[PDB]
Amino acid sequence: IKEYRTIKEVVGPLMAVEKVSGVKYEELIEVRMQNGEIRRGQVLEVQEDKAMVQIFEGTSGINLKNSSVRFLGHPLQLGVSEDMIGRVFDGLGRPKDNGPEILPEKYLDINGEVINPIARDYPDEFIQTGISAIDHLNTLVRGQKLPVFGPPGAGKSALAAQIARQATVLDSSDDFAVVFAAIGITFEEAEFFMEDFRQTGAIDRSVMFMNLANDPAIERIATPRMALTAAEYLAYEKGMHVLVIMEDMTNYAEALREISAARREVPGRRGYPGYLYTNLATLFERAGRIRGLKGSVTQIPILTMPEDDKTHPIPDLTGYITEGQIILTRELYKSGISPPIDVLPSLSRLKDKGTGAGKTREDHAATMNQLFAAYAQGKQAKELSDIDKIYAKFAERFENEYVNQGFYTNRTITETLDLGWELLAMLPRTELKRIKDDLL
Amino acid sequence: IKEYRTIKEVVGPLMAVEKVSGVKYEELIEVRMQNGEIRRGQVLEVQEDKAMVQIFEGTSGINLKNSSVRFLGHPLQLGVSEDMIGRVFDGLGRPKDNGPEILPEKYLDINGEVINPIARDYPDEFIQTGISAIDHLNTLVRGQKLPVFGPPGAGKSALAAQIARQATVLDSSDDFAVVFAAIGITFEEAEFFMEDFRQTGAIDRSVMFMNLANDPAIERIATPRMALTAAEYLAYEKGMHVLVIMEDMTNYAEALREISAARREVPGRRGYPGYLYTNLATLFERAGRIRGLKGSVTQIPILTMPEDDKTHPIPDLTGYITEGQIILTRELYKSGISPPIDVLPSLSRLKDKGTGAGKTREDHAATMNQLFAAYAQGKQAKESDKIYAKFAERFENEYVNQGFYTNRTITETLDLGWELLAMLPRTELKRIK
Amino acid sequence: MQIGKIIKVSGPLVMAENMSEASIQDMCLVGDLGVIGEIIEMRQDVASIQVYEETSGIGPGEPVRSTGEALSVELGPGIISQMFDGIQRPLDTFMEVTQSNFLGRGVQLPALDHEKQWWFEATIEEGTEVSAGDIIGYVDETKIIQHKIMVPNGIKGTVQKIESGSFTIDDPICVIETEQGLKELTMMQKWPVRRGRPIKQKLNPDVPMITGQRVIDTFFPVTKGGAAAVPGPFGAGKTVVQHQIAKWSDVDLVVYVGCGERGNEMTDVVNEFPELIDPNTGESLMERTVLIANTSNMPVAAREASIYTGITIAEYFRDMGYDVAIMADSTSRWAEALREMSGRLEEMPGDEGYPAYLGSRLAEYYERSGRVIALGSDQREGSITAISAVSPSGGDISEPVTQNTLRVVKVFWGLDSSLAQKRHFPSINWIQSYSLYSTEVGRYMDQILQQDWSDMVTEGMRILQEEEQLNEIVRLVGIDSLSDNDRLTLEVAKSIREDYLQQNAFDDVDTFTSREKQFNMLKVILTFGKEARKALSLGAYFNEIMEGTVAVRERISRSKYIPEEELAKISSINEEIKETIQLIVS
Ligand SMILES: Nc1ncnc2c1ncn2[C@@H]1O[C@H](COP(=O)(O)OP(=O)(O)O)[C@@H](O)[C@H]1O
Ligand SMILES: Nc1ncnc2c1ncn2[C@@H]1O[C@H](COP(=O)(O)OP(=O)(O)O)[C@@H](O)[C@H]1O
Ligand SMILES: [Mg+2]
Ligand SMILES: [Mg+2]
């Protein structure tokens, strides 16, 4: 058990340890304080017989001469087992549910490893979010990276909860699992998530990593990578189709800027790290499917946009990543619409791999195209005569019945499509582009 | 002169040499690498124990302990002689023609010296470039600094070859020479110039210094000083009227910013060094004439435009150091008109001292002014004024468009202008004609 | 032989002592894992190494071993139809050796098969005096391509013994007694990635390359040795244009370089190239391709080096006299890798955070292409044609990468998202795009077609330009405003756009249009333009012409679909056109 009693210098969150041997870059450490308090840290630098570390909880109260540093001999790791489903952890993969101690099959590097370009497979089949405006129009496929954006307080937390409890896959024998990671969420909202997850029984399908707004920022960095490591284990080793949901990754970006500022790495994107884009890119790129392996990992990141005019590095991060998008809007949130999805700007690039026959149903693409076109022109009607009373009434009925379904009420794609037909009939029967005469 | 195996340190393109003595700031360096390859360098800074040098060809592959450095005991020089005319060199004054290599009369610090302002002579004479609207409407003067611009891939580089071939002086009492400096242009552009010169025979009055886009940036910075040193030698020591043409000075500024970043110097506006203005000044201010000495150094630098966007430091600073401006534009070029010179934005601030009676001919100033304003209203009407707009149309196709391979006599530029104003009623001036 | 010791590890930068014998830019295997790194500095015996992989878990005391070379490429039999990353690591051999889907750290695999058996057929007589570049024999690496074993650079002398035989690329196939001694030759030579390969002489690229893409080859063509930037927004093309040129170009070899793109954008090419067997030779495209693959998450140094590794391979193949085409998709990702490593080195920014050397780096890359007289006695001729896709974020071509590229390339095919939404998917905006080769290739095509081709190209461009100007008066004052011949000018412009400019990548006949076919298809459109104006000069009206030319104009519509055996049909069109109008004019 390696531990040194040689702290020479502490400056802010950083400590200088001396007469050291065998310490490695980014290895984990524990500062065992002179009072017996233990604090976690990481190795920033190792120089000959010296090591500079950064203390996660800060260096308050530390007496240098009567404390020691234990060198754990490994990087940041996740304990890994099939027992994780039905369990709740914190930002560091430590349990928070008071549940039975889990024996990891193995510990894996939280960064994971990078896919061989040869071995990567196309995203294909269909994940049923249980939400029409997603499942039907902006279809989520397994292996896709589909983020949801919005302004503060736009149902995105509730929407993420709904997708977490209602998402499943239809024809796969080997079952669906969902990994939920909350990033810097207030205790009230995390507790709300827990009561909802527990009442719905969705925890039994889930692995949850909860990080709170007052948690250490470095834990906010670790949480999404924690989630993706668990997802990659379940998907590529235990063969599951895994859905990863990440709340307020904007909170993640701010925490990453915070950690960078503590390390004094003079950064140049409005104080943000500068590699902010590359960090999110390496994080976002961790989705997809591997050749010859039945598993899949899917990401739904949730982010917050202050305004479209306001220039910020975080929205431009989103610009570098998107493979589609689902957009929530405040003016629309007020209207009482349950998922406030402005359907026009939201897009899914890979919708067509998930739609079809044997996947969703034959009517999927057809219904989607007609609904979108008619809704665009009919909303612009809400903005004579040929602006159809029928059209604008269809747009408002579409928003108040079809897109609004209840955060606790899931629409199967069959029922989504059947409702689509129900209200699609209230349209001029020969005003539709339909190369297959439908005859429902 | 001795060889030093005293290489202590290499960080990027910078070396630290140790146990030096009698090393001077800006002195030159030769590194004999462990494999025998020779690379030249320049001292940036020199102390008692040590000197810092930057290697032109870079520091790649250098083994420190088994390489040697020799301090050449002189700065960047140019070996000059009259034998330079007809020859083409690289950015460093080394031959590229496979020709009879020169034995110089002497070596001159390519930094040169600054003319005593008392001894400076105000520019006051005519140079026939052979392009009608340059010689006529926007007339170039001996010793003047008048730059030209261009859109990427729009013929701004063909105008240089044309100007260089047709540039001459009428009096011909002393000979006229043109110095062409290529600054970070592609191999295809440099080849176009070299072959144009060789096939037209303009090399026979020319000295050419060619620096390529993939050449080292420090060499790119050196190039214009090599050229202007040769020009000042030909003009102020051999009495020639020299025309210095610099192809793409925006590339000069890019190379200067690149060396400034390489040396971690405090950035100026948008990365460009804080000394960028004065550094362009030491180039531009090398034009002119000297009291009591025949011979002129005349400069026309060519700059690629910032593409009608927000103000950029180099046009701004050039304008603060130069006087005039000329513009080339795709709007005339893709209309098929060549040279695609926009007459309205163009100007020669020193024109009035180059043209008059005894320089060109009587009917020059009135032609310049009258045809200019007539084209202005003709274009504004074009885009019964019976045919006042058609005056602009003809000015476009016959007066401006003379051809990249046509050397107009100055008098026939004047004659064509006059025959064009015949369209306009004679009710326009109080002059004899 | 010298073992260095790590004395410092801080993120990407490792400092190792006792490495006096290494050289700057030497590659090293760092730490116990042996992760690859590059010497950027040296202070006494202490080298600063910038490592290419993650340094997590590496610390002082561990060994560092220099590979005695800079980033280099292995060149020899076994290179074709392989898929490397930016540093020439065999991706399939990763699959096999490491038995995993992931790129582990510090695992070294030789690029080529040093165990494979190849039949060397010698072609030099014993006693022949050789200098660098001389072909000493060949191996038929594929059914298509002859891999020509050349004597390496820096070697001169007399062949002492050489005999045909079955060997490895490690076995000696030839013996050269140079001035210094006798040293055997192998089938493989290494070359540093960042240093261009020596040539006898650089030439102008004046021969046009046959893309089979009508837009390009007629209006914005790229010569064998030229350089073409493909700047456009997403979905416009520029991955299909890369593919299309790689398929149908009249070039021996193709080096496709994936510059750290998104994972799925690479998955596409990874699967789609093998089934792109063009029938000009009847063998697969991979049979003539070297593919460098890099994804967004892969090591930054690999993404940055990708294009240089690729162009080194392209140089190695044009040194045998071959024509090579190098494809970069996309150089914007390459520049982002460059910027990332410049920032992590704490360098001084230039524009948009890009390094100050961005421009000069781009010039260094593009000037390594071109037409060249290769080394060797016979003075072979080779060419490298560079086609580089750029993805300016938001389609802004004012951005540093595109502006610096456009500074040195001489071909610009600017993709326009508006045409793509219009499904004019050879989105190459005819007004904005250009080629500075157009006049030289015009003279070339005038002589070898022995027709007045360039007159036709100027006429087509003229009607397109006038189309642009007349569509504005259409938008503001209506189509009825226009002259009768003005409406004719627009309709012949619609002909040139829809019948000639648009070209489907996935139809067997439209995907490639030969020079002969290009000439005839354009000619019939232009003869239509000529005859109808005469009708108006006589007094016939535009509608009078259109009603009566419906059929002949549907024949020009299908001109692109007539196969390469039956171009007499297109030749028949223009004459049939002429006879048809004379009946309408009355
Ligand atoms: N109606 C509202 N308008 C504006 N801001 C709100 C509103 N409701 C909540 N907020 C702010 O946003 C936070 C929660 O928003 P968010 O995290 O997006 O989840 P949700 O959208 O589900 O409320 C709250 O802590 C509150 O500060
Ligand atoms: N020349 C072409 N012919 C037919 N379709 C094309 C052509 N170029 C592009 N496309 C269409 O555009 C789609 C995507 O274009 P792509 O080359 O991937 O653009 P990007 O690389 O910008 O994403 C292709 O699937 C194809 O359907
Ligand atoms: Mg919330
Ligand atoms: Mg692409």
Side-chain angles (χ1 to χ4, degrees), chain A residues 117-316:
Chain A
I118 297 305
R120 194 185 291 275
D121 208 3
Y122 310 87
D124 197 40
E125 266 164 337
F126 159 80
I127 293 171
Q128 203 199 245
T129 183
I131 297 171
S132 62
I134 310 178
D135 263 339
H136 189 272
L137 288 66
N138 299 263
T139 309
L140 184 69
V141 307
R142 322 187 306 215
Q144 197 186 348
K145 176 194 54 47
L146 185 54
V148 170
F149 297 2
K156 65 181 72 173
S157 302
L159 163 57
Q162 176 170 203
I163 311 190
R165 58 182 160 254
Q166 304 186 4
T168 184
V169 54
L170 301 184
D171 290 320
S172 74
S173 75
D174 207 355
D175 275 328
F176 197 61
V178 57
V179 181
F180 187 82
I183 314 298
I185 285 305
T186 183
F187 167 83
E188 282 199 38
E189 289 172 351
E191 201 60 61
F192 195 114
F193 268 124
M194 305 305 105
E195 196 207 339
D196 198 351
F197 262 101
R198 284 160 330 184
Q199 72 170 3
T200 299
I203 301 174
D204 302 345
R205 298 78 174 270
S206 302
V207 183
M208 303 146 51
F209 302 79
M210 314 301 302
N211 171 329
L212 307 99
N214 66 278
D215 271 3
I218 199 69
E219 303 184 1
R220 274 187 297 280
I221 308 302
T223 303
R225 298 157 213 286
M226 283 296 191
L228 293 167
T229 317
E232 289 179 339
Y233 167 65
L234 299 178
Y236 305 143
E237 272 179 38
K238 295 331 175 201
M240 294 187 189
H241 296 233
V242 186
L243 165 67
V244 191
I245 299 170
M246 295 180 185
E247 171 88 20
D248 241 332
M249 297 276 307
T250 289
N251 273 348
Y252 169 82
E254 282 207 22
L256 172 52
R257 171 187 50 176
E258 198 181 12
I259 291 313
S260 302
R263 290 161 170 185
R264 320 270 329 258
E265 293 177 350
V266 296
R269 319 279 221 280
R270 294 311 151 160
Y272 272 89
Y275 69 91
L276 186 54
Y277 310 76
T278 49
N279 194 267
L280 275 188
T282 61
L283 197 64
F284 284 122
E285 184 72 21
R286 274 181 90 160
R289 310 184 54 243
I290 291 173
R291 287 203 208 286
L293 285 63
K294 48 158 161 298
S296 69
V297 62
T298 323
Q299 295 183 359
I300 306 192
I302 309 318
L303 298 95
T304 305
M305 41 165 88
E307 193 203 15
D308 70 295
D309 274 45
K310 223 175 318 179
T311 181
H312 213 259
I314 313 176
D316 190 40

Side-chain angles (χ1 to χ4, degrees), chain B residues 17-258:
Chain B
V17 185
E18 192 178 5
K19 292 160 85 176
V20 288
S21 176
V23 179
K24 313 290 167 194
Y25 169 53
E26 289 199 7
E27 186 171 333
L28 289 176
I29 291 298
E30 264 193 13
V31 181
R32 190 170 335 258
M33 294 164 63
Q34 73 277 332
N35 59 15
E37 171 177 349
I38 301 297
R39 303 198 181 154
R40 297 174 60 98
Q42 186 156 49
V43 300
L44 298 176
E45 177 166 346
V46 59
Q47 298 188 358
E48 313 198 65
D49 55 350
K50 179 260 293 180
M52 291 294 293
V53 300
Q54 191 195 327
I55 315 302
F56 300 168
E57 303 91 355
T59 50
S60 177
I62 294 184
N63 172 276
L64 274 63
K65 73 169 186 204
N66 277 126
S67 298
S68 74
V69 303
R70 199 147 34 83
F71 292 83
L72 301 188
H74 65 91
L76 276 163
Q77 288 162 332
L78 184 57
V80 293
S81 75
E82 298 102 319
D83 298 334
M84 292 174 328
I85 292 169
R87 306 293 302 285
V88 177
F89 311 93
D90 64 357
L92 280 299
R94 304 180 290 221
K96 287 175 67 176
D97 50 18
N98 311 333
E101 191 167 7
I102 65 168
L103 287 78
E105 182 167 297
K106 48 168 164 178
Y107 295 93
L108 299 172
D109 195 344
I110 66 156
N111 287 326
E113 288 181 351
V114 72
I115 311 187
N116 190 315
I118 291 294
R120 175 174 281 267
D121 219 324
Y122 203 62
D124 293 303
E125 261 155 20
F126 180 54
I127 279 182
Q128 201 187 351
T129 182
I131 296 93
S132 82
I134 298 171
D135 287 328
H136 186 295
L137 302 156
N138 295 317
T139 301
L140 181 45
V141 176
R142 298 174 217 186
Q144 189 200 3
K145 58 179 74 69
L146 187 66
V148 178
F149 299 85
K156 108 206 138 253
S157 297
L159 185 67
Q162 191 202 348
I163 295 180
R165 181 177 65 83
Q166 316 179 200
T168 182
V169 285
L170 276 88
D171 289 345
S172 100
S173 155
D174 46 356
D175 309 324
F176 184 95
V178 63
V179 170
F180 190 86
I183 298 178
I185 69 171
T186 77
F187 152 80
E188 295 218 56
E189 305 200 74
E191 214 59 30
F192 156 71
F193 291 115
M194 284 150 102
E195 223 273 312
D196 162 84
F197 278 68
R198 294 171 101 120
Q199 193 94 320
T200 187
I203 198 54
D204 299 329
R205 69 187 64 109
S206 298
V207 192
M208 289 175 70
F209 301 88
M210 313 300 286
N211 196 244
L212 300 191
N214 69 330
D215 286 340
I218 185 151
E219 305 185 8
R220 198 169 323 161
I221 298 320
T223 313
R225 291 177 170 80
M226 291 267 185
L228 293 163
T229 307
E232 290 188 309
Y233 168 77
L234 295 179
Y236 300 148
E237 290 200 53
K238 307 283 153 176
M240 296 180 186
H241 287 323
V242 182
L243 186 68
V244 180
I245 297 170
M246 292 178 180
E247 177 57 19
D248 203 0
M249 293 296 289
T250 47
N251 289 336
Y252 175 81
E254 301 303 307
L256 200 71
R257 189 183 54 176
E258 185 176 314

Side-chain angles (χ1 to χ4, degrees), chain C residues 233-235 237-240 242 256 261 265 269 329-330 333 389 391:
Chain C
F234 197 80
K238 154 202 52 173
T239 298
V240 173
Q242 298 293 108
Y256 197 90
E261 275 266 24
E265 296 216 44
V269 295
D329 197 24
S330 84
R333 310 283 79 77
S391 298

